[PDB]
Write a protein that binds this DNA or RNA. Sequence first.
RNA 1: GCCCGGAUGGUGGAAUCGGUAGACACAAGGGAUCCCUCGGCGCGCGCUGUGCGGGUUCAAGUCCCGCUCCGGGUACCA
Length: 860
Amino acid sequence: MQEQYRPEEIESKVQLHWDEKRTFEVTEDESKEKYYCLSMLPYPSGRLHMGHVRNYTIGDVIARYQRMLGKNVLQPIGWDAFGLPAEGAAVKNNTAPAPWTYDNIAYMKNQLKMLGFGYDWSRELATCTPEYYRWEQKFFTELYKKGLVYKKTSAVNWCPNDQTVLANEQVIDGCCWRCDTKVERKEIPQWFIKITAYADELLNDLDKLDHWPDTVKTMQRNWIGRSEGVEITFNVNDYDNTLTVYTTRPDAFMGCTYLAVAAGHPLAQKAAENNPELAAFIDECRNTKVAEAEMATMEKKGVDTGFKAVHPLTGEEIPVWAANFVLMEYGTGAVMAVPGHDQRDYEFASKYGLNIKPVILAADGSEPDLSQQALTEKGVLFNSGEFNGLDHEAAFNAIADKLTAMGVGERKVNYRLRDWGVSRQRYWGAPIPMVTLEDGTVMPTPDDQLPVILPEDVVMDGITSPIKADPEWAKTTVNGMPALRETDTFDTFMESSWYYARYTCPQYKEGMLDSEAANYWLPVDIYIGGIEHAIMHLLYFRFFHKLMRDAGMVNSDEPAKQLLCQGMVLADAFYYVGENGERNWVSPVDAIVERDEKGRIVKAKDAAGHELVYTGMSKMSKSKNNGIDPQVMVERYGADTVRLFMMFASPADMTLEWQESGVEGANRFLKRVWKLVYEHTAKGDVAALNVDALTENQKALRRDVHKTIAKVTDDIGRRQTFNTAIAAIMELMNKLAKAPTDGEQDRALMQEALLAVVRMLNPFTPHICFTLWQELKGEGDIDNAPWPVADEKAMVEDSTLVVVQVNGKVRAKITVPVDATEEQVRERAGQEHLVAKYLDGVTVRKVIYVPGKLLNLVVG
RNA sequence: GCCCGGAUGGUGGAAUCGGUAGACACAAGGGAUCCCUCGGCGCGCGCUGUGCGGGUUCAAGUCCCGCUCCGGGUACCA
Ligand SMILES: CC(C)C[C@H](N)C(=O)NS(=O)(=O)OC[C@H]1O[C@@H](n2cnc3c(N)ncnc32)[C@H](O)[C@@H]1O
Ligand SMILES: CC(C)C[C@H](N)C(=O)N[C@@H]1[C@H](O)[C@@H](CO)O[C@H]1n1cnc2c(N)ncnc21
Ligand SMILES: [Zn+2]
């Protein structure tokens, strides 16, 4: 051990020890108690960023902590390799997406090894390899034969000049990011998986997930959006078909003055042949991007179709209107608009001058004033024929039962949740195992012809996929006849839905899962990911677990016991307009900035000489080009210093605006720990610690040692507040510096403390603590060492602080015995001059007393 | 727009069940790697202070109602 702390010599040497000895390689050991510490696998974009390092340090801190308790901890790492950014990068850099991805896997693997995350590298997966995606292709064909898969048409962003399907990210300002030509909706046939079949199970089992956070669970409820209502069919005068609409408020059905309809609905298509104005409005609605954000933000417009739907109860002819705000996907592509008691319909009715009929009385029991706004609340009915006087309960059921008796309506459970559309029409993805025969019949790819291997070695023009462009690739022979297999590929969420299960048996050749191995590890004890994946991924992840359960693969109903959704790591994001309107995103490192007096950014110029558009703070990513590479800080300060800084700066769940300020405290702290152990070990081996033969300062120091162990254990294990745990050890270390190491009992006590501190820091800074553990003559490696347990008799308090208050303001503070009555606390508090100052010439009205904590005195 | 969260000294943050506001660090100034000072306004004291406006309470950063700004998701970014 040198006097100076030099990471570059220590860290890589300890990293080699873990690889050669295979410290974090684990098997299904029935003797040890199991623990699955899963962190969400990354997309190999190129470099790591401080978002990644936060996620994986949190996981590694938990994984090393649970090992030291004495459990067989599985912390796996893999690569969610398929994706869009590979194709964009491959075309620009003149490569194929496969070798580009494998380079980025190789680079980031070495960056993860540098950071020293104790992963099981024998279980390493890559989702782009056919050894992985063969099983999901086999799984997909089974789901089709169960009837959970079905084909239907779906809206897609389509640049008509290129003849290519764009993503939501690839559209910007309602325009194509490559070329100058506007995007439009194209209805295209695609494969869907019935996630709505498991909607009630996904909704109900949130109540059993008590160790998941209410933030994530509440978002998933609202996303699913279960809804009990009524379907109501209408007749339309000069129109051969009928219009069904969904509604949760059939009580207000008598106030339905019109019917709003979506743009692509066949009634609007039929009306637009004759009507020239509606033809212009439908073609305007083609420009509407496939996104709910842009749908609600844009102005609510509409056109009268010409048709008149007959209202079943009243018998009145009401106008059917085409409108943008009505979604095609939710409901049935049409609604019963009650503008009197719906703020969205009120504005539509007031704009285009439609009738606003009131049918619900206000809470006072009177006719509501609908001059400024609609009455959204529920109440008694009026001006509603036979249904007058009924409250919401009776009004709902009476009109439902009437419409059920008439045979023009029925009760139905609806979900906001749509089915999982898995068809993508890009190259870099697992191909869908479906075959179109020469017959015309569509059936699954046979088991002998699985997997449908995606050819890695290809050349991409950028417009069209090579497997689509080449006519030879699609050819096959099924059931003794020519056939064309599906050139569309899976959604990338498909691969990341079941990877957690595959980690348990990743080299299992004989099936999708080795259930003996899977049921040992599963379910997952802690799942560490970003808050971004609260809904989309986690809902698929849960859904896919339930499918594997229903195929007899896994025991549990839920995949993960505990969820730790960490907050995003934010960074500044800049860009400039290119010559062909191309958004070239510039990094914060390259941006030259002039700031505001408050703190905000005002001007922004890149190194070359372009006026940068400052978008704002946003999540670190390859897309916005705002990720900060840890490699620079790791080289300078060391992985331990970077790792400690990430955990110390902010609590896991809260978001973090990134800045390097604060690292120097983490660096200096680790030098102080190194220094104190150097000074301690230099004096030689210590005496055996006599517990009941210490001074009061030694007893108080030992109290703080075991109290820190109690706090650090609680803060990590129960709370996951790592910032408070690391701060608690800094307090103890600051106290241990001032402690005099003269006598043998002082050094005996300094041994116990330093053994505890090095073990408590180990999950955060494992490289430095591996070295310090050996230097203190600890048994074996620190990785396998037992986690320190706090002694109850050491933490005993004889006295306690009591804060004296006068009208809720602190005037004095006093030390009192723990078993002291309220009379003794008042008499003791009265002796303080600042307390006696505000009690002269006034009557004590009330005396509140929190036992051994606080004493307020209300004064008159 | 809708759903979910956040805002505390120059800066990141602490206060775990309504009960000492600013632990622990950074940056800054001053002294000799170590020590001192450090929310604001006028002292070994007094008032005030947790984005903004009301309310409940003996007591609110914490609970309630109404805003402002900022982030995440919004179904083809992963
Ligand atoms: C299961 C699967 C669908 C996961 C998917 N393959 C994936 O997300 N891959 S990844 O490379 O983008 O990220 C890996 C982990 O890191 C988190 N993360 C990402 N960006 C940030 C950020 N700016 N700040 C904080 N965390 C971030 C992210 O949530 C995830 O847990
Ligand atoms: C008195 C009000 C509530 C009547 C309103 N015109 C309506 O029927 N709203 C529908 C349902 O009450 C509710 C179901 O959650 O959402 C409305 N709705 C149904 N389908 C759609 C759709 N496709 N687009 C927009 N809103 C819709
Ligand atoms: Zn284009």
